[PDB]
Amino acid sequence: MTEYKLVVVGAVGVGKSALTIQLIQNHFVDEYDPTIEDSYRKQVVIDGETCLLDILDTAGQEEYSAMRDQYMRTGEGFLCVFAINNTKSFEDIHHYREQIKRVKDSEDVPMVLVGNKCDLPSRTVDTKQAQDLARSYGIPFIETSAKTRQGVDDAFYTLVREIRKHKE
Numbered sequence: 001m002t003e004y005k006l007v008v009v010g011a012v013g014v015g016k017s018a019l020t021i022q023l024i025q026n027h028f029v030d031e032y033d034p035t036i037e038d039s040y041r042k043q044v045v046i047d048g049e050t051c052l053l054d055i056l057d058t059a060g061q062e063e064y065s066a067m068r069d070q071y072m073r074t075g076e077g078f079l080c081v082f083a084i085n086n087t088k089s090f091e092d093i094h095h096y097r098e099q100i101k102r103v104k105d106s107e108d109v110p111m112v113l114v115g116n117k118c119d120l121p122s123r124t125v126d127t128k129q130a131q132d133l134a135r136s137y138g139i140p141f142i143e144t145s146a147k148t149r150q151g152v153d154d155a156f157y158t159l160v161r162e163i164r165k166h167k168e
């Protein structure tokens with residue numbers, strides 16, 4: 001009875017809470033308190049198989065809990081999110097990739113790079129840039145929009161699929 005513990009990381013404002021709520025609840029949140037760091041559960045059929053997704057949506061806050069601990073420790077895969085209209089959130093990606101390696105003492109962590117807000121026309125990080133970054137970490141790269149649902153399931157299920165490869 002497989003449950004996958006997914007962790008969503010990235011700079012503030014990139015859409016980590018919106019992606020999670022799109023996937024779990026199928027609507028787009030226009031605002032969501034940046035300090036709310038919860039987990040969200042759902043049962044989905046991925047590639048024809050049912051599973052339990054436990055998704056911790058991080059909020060980088062000096063307030064405390066065990067879930068943000070009990071999960072960054074043994075979350076099995078991480079979504080690293082930036083926004084395609086937010087160069088600074090792309091420049092921070094390497095900070096978050098390094099954090100994950102430290103918290104799991106491994107450079108073999110299941111991981112997907114997500115470029116969110118692809119519905120927005122004022123783009124400053126282009127697809128090639130992001131692809132090159134992903135190809136240098138060894139990881140898939142997925143373009144999403146929490147507003148339109150584009151790529152949203154694909155981000156999360158590719159990560160689940162990477163966790164599957166890793167188990168072997």
Ligand SMILES: Nc1nc2c(ncn2[C@@H]2O[C@H](COP(=O)(O)OP(=O)(O)O)[C@@H](O)[C@H]2O)c(=O)[nH]1
Binds near residue numbers: 013014030033116119
């Ligand atoms: N246009 C557009 N806006 C988005 C998208 N995803 C998130 N947003 C908006 O970006 C802002 C920050 O989103 P949020 O989920 O709170 O980011 P977080 O800080 O990573 O949790 C919110 O106002 C969202 O409505 C998207 O795919 N497209």
Ligand SMILES: [Mg+2]
Binds near residue numbers: 016032034036058
């Ligand atoms: Mg948030």
